[PDB]
Amino acid sequence: QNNDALSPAIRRLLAEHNLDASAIKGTGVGGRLTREDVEKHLAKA
Questions:
Q1: What CATH superfamily classification does 1-45 receive?
Q2: How many Cβ atoms from other residues are within 10 Å of residue 5's Cβ?
Q3: Cβ partners under 8 Å of residue 34, min gap 6
Q4: Within the chain, what is the greatest distance between any pair of CA atoms?
């Protein structure tokens, strides 16, 4: 029913910047994490 909030690309990206999706908010289909949320989280970090 509810797909995984973490995506393959987002995971690699997150691990790259030592970030965690937990700190990032997902605005995808159902509230999942998106490249926009990851890149945005770093823009302020």
A1: E3-binding domain (4.10.320.10)
A2: 17
A3: 7, 10, 26, 27, 28
A4: 33
